[PDB]
């Protein structure tokens, strides 16, 4: 046995006839049960670590498996080996040590031992030196993956029972490892990333035949798979898209159907994409912070002297164990990056994601004819039945992969023509809220869209511009879908604004580079003013207090830093406030830039009486903080870290004014906002812009000063009108506004007079009477013409002396 | 006669049954040996949903066959 493994190249012909001897005698299974458990024992006990490092051994093991798998009469009954399936009480981490297929599927270069061998020798290798280490192993890993695929595919076609047995085998592994997606999963109790990554790759390669570029083999996958209960994939506890547990159960009961291997595999590969590489990427992403935490822990101890004999040895060993742990962690982080940067494997995964997106879009199609004919474009009740009962991993998996995998310059997403299949699915998710009721996975999809549209370092259009331009489904409704999802993100609240941040990048880039979207905008404002006015209002509302939040957060960070200028929760909240300050500063700048580029071309949408009073107050309040002592005195360390550049924001703020400066309504509204208006503010802004040489043109300043002079003379006329109305009767004042009522109406509940606008604004928030808590509606009011006649009489009496 | 029942978690159990026994009696035996209430249980044979009032001979279930028990997804 030992000599067979050591010298398999000589026993490959002597033992082959022995194998053929039992094929004709019908006693092959006895020797199969005698040899493979012995091979497992040899790999477990005689070798402490059967891994990729021992190039001699696993090459012989794979050769033995290749010798055995070729025989058709053997592969059909290969699943009857003792120990082929795991135990019912088998631990999730014991799959790769007590199974025939266990150790062989665990061959991966991302193992801890291989990482220590090939990374722990030098920790500060250069970027050029790094790629050589990866490529020295990627080719060998490709051979291992190819041989494992060759074995498993022959197991697939061996017989009808083998394909069911292997699906059952993969199902038991999938269900035992649902904690891989957890925040701090039990890594010592769950399956290793190497054992599961190879399995994820094998099924994706299995999907290559019937996911062809013709998309004609797309009907081989059953779209009615989840109508019947699943016998392999455990859907218990798995969230559905737009259906709760009771409706899904009744729908299983409703309509009361044979299993097929193509659909069994095509939905198991997605489960392995989610709970497999999806958890692997989240594991690798947290390596950037655990190393930082461990470095501080090691640094703290190194300042302690060691004298006490019982304690000195303990301290010395504590440092050494942490040194070994740091070695392993830095080796693993470097190994996983090279594993993920191998394009020959990631292109296949992304192409499969594209094919699966095509399949999903076909499922969404009422005619189910998407790959041939294009689709035409409360929420739970109107959702399509096949789409609504699907689980939530089929979207979470690919989106996590695309979000995580985009951070490399060597990404497979770049320059892949088959990419547009995923984009159509994303735009479909964007268009109809009936498809998904979850706004959080929607926020992740939008953030992925934001990542895809980011300009590169050379300022060239991103790898997504061609698809935003050359996709006939996207360009029809991408604008409306984004505008609609901007306002629904509303449903403390430290996350509803990051989605707005991601939407802002997409809006600005689409307005910049795509003139057809520049026509769809303007067309949106001129023929669908009701929809776009809500978007304008939703952008305007948050912008009032984002600067306040940023100022509070930066002051909080400074106070926390001065606290340490004299326990760790203060540092944690420093980081938390730093992130919220960065978000506030970024989203305020994006909102202001969008306001600038929108008032540049369509000022007519900004002068409507329903937003004109709010816009002037917001702009004045933002201006006073930027030009006042609040922003100047707040000296932030490295302001570019937080994107806190009030000098750069002031240019857009003033351009908003000058863009709307050709409208009398905007000039009047600003002069009527006494809350935050001053002629000295623009004078100060002139000098602030003069500090930044070349930022503002002299004619720019001249236009700003002309606007300021017009607003000042307007407010002087307003206060001239104000001074001629001195003492006033109390009955002619609004009991809530304390001003003269232009259109006094009588409240039916409290029998008191109120202005139409005042009660209209109150009813815009709640349909209750302010004075007696009674129900109240806009249609319940009663105009008071008699009192308005006396208002006119008194105004004319005051005009008799003016 | 004995039959094999397979679960979503991979549990394989034996059960002495008769061709004329009602399916609800089979679920009662499964509850006796495992404690799972019959209404929560949901048995599958040959990829088809079963009915409580029918018998094994009605569904042509041979002895020592394989049954798939799916626990109906409980609420929270």
């Amino acid at each position: 046995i030992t000599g067979i493994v050591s010298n398999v190249n000589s026993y490959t012909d002597f033992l082959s006839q022995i194998i053929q001897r039992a094929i004709l005698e019908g006693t092959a299974l006895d020797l199969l049960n005698a040899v493979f458990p012995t091979l497992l024992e040899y790999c477990n006990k005689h070798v402490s670590h059967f891994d990729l490092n021992e190039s001699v051994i696993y090459n012989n093991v794979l050769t033995i498996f290749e010798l055995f798998v070729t025989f058709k009469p053997i592969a059909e009954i290969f699943t009857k080996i003792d120990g082929f399936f795991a135990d019912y009480s088998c631990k999730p981490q014991d799959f790769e040590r007590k199974t025939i297929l266990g150790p062989i599927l665990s061959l991966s270069p991302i193992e801890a031992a291989v990482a220590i061998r090939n990374y722990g020798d030098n920790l500060l290798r250069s970027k050029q030196q790094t790629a050589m280490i990866h490529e020295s192993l990627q080719a060998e890993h490709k051979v291992v993956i190819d041989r494992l695929f060759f074995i498993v595919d022959k197991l697939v076609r061996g017989s009808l029972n083998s394909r069911t047995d292997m699906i059952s085998y993969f199902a038991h592994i999938a269900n035992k490892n649902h904690l891989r997606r957890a925040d701090h999963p039990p890594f010592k109790e769950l399956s290793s990333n190497g054992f599961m990554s190879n399995i994820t790759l094998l099924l994706v390669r299995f999907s290559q035949p019937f996911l062809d570029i013709s998309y004609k083999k797309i009907d081989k996958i059953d779209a009615n798979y989840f109508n019947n209960p699943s016998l392999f994939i455990d859907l218990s506890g798995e969230t559905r898209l737009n259906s709760d547990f009771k409706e899904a159960d009744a729908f299983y009961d409703k309509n009361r159907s044979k299993p097929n291997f193509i659909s069994d595999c095509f939905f198991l590969t997605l489960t392995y994409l989610h709970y497999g590489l999806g958890g692997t990427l989240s594991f690798e992403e947290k390596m950037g912070s655990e190393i930082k935490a461990l470095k501080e822990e090691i640094e703290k101890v190194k300042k302690i002297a060691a004298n006490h004999d019982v304690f000195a040895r303990f301290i010395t060993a504590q440092l050494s164990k942490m040194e070994k742990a740091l070695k392993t962690t830095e080796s693993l982080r470097f190994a996983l990056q090279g594993f993920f940067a191998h394009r020959s494997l990631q292109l296949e995964v992304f192409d499969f994601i594209c094919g699966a997106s095509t399949f999903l879009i076909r499922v969404v199609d009422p005619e189910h004819e998407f790959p041939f004919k294009q689709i035409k474009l409360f929420l739970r009740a109107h959702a399509p039945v096949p789409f609504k009962y699907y689980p939530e991993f089929v979207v979470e998996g690919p989106v996590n992969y695309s979000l995580y995998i985009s951070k490399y310059q060597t990404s497979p997403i770049f320059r892949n023509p088959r990419l547009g299949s995923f984009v159509e699915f994303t735009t479909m998710v964007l268009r109809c809220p009936e498809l998904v009721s979850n706004p959080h996975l929607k926020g992740k999809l939008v953030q992925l869209l934001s990542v895809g549209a980011m300009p590169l370092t050379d300022n060239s259009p991103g790898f997504m511009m061609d698809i935003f331009e050359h996709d006939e489904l996207v360009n029809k409704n991408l604008l409306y879908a984004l505008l609609d999802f901007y306002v629904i993100v509303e449903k403390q609240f430290y996350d509803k604004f990051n989605s707005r941040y991601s939407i802002s990048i997409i809006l600005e880039e689409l307005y910049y580079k795509i003139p057809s979207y520049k026509n769809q905008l303007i067309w949106q404002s001129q023929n669908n003013a009701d929809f776009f006015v809500r978007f304008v209002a939703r952008m305007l509302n948050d912008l009032t207090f984002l600067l306040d939040e940023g100022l509070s957060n930066l002051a909080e960070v400074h106070n926390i830093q001065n606290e340490l200028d004299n326990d760790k929760e203060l540092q944690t909240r420093l980081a938390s406030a730093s992130r919220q300050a960065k978000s506030s500063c970024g989203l305020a700048d994006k909102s202001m830039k969008l306001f600038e580029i929108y008032s540049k071309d369509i000022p007519a949408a900004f002068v409507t009486p329903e937003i004109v009073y709010r816009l002037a107050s917001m702009l004045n309040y933002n201006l006073e903080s930027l030009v006042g002592p609040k922003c100047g005195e707040l000296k932030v360390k490295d302001p570019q870290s937080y994107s806190f550049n009030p000098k750069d924001l002031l240019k857009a703020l003033t351009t908003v004014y000058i863009n709307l400066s050709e409208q009398s309504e905007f000039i009047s509204a600003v002069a009527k906002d006494e809350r935050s208006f001053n002629r000295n503010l623009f004078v100060r802004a002139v000098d602030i812009l003069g500090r930044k040489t070349g930022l503002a043109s002299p004619e720019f300043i001249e236009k700003l000063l002309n606007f300021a002079n017009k607003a000042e003379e307007q407010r002087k006329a307003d206060e001239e009108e104000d001074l001629e109305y001195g003492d006033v009767p109390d009955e002619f004042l609004d009991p809530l506004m304390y001003t003269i009522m232009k259109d006094p109406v009588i409240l039916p509940a409290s029998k008191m007079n109120i202005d139409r606008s005042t009660i209209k604004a109150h009813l815009l928030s709640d349909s209750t009477d302010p004075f007696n808590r009674m129900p109240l509606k806009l249609e319940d009011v009663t105009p008071n013409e008699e009192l308005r006649q006396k208002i006119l009489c008194f105004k004319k009496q005051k005009k008799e002396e003016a | 006669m004995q039959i094999f029942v397979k679960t979503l978690t991979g549990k394989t159990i034996t059960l002495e049954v008769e061709p004329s026994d009602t399916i609800e009696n089979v679920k009662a035996r499964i509850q006796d040996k495992e404690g799972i209430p019959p209404d929560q249980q949901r048995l599958i044979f040959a990829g088809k949903q079963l009915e409580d009032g029918r018998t094994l001979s009605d569904y042509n279930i041979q002895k020592e066959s394989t049954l798939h028990l799916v626990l109906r997804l409980r609420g929270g």
Partner: protein, 148 residues
């Protein structure tokens, strides 16, 4: 037009009739940032303590409740270390006819009664429902520490 004159007349009304145990006013010449000062009820361990209020009036005061926070540290279950107050009329139970004087009177009423079914601080809430002698003693202890 919408906010200035309401705040001005509310200031004038308190100027006419100042509250007995309370006192409020703007901070400098900034109309939208006031300061209130109150003195604890005699029938309470908060007597003899003076607390200042941090007030932030929003741009839509006549239709949205103010943002008002405590400045002095007080041993009270409904008040956190940030000075936030767990009170009802500062939420969806707000009415446009309510005045700031009534809000300050309600602050004193909350100080008098100390509704415990709103646990902003769980430890003090558990303390109040088990033994008065420690809650009452600690209230006066922190009043002497801070509210002097």
């Amino acid at each position: 037009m919408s906010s200035s004159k309401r705040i001005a007349k509310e200031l004038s009304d308190l100027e006419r009739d100042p509250p007995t145990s309370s006192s409020a006013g703007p901070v400098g010449d900034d109309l939208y940032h006031w300061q209130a000062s109150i003195m604890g009820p005699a029938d309470s361990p908060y007597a003899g303590g003076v607390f200042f209020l941090s007030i932030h009036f929003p741009t839509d005061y006549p239709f949205k409740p103010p943002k008002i926070s405590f400045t002095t540290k007080i041993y009270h279950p409904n008040i956190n270390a940030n000075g936030n107050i767990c009170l009802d009329i500062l939420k969806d139970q707000w009415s446009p006819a309510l005045t700031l004087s009534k809000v300050l009177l309600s602050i004193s009423s909350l100080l008098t009664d100390a509704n415990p079914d709103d646990p902003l601080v769980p430890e003090i809430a558990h303390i109040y429902k088990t033994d008065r002698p420690k809650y009452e003693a600690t209230a006066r202890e922190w009043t002497k520490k801070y509210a002097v």
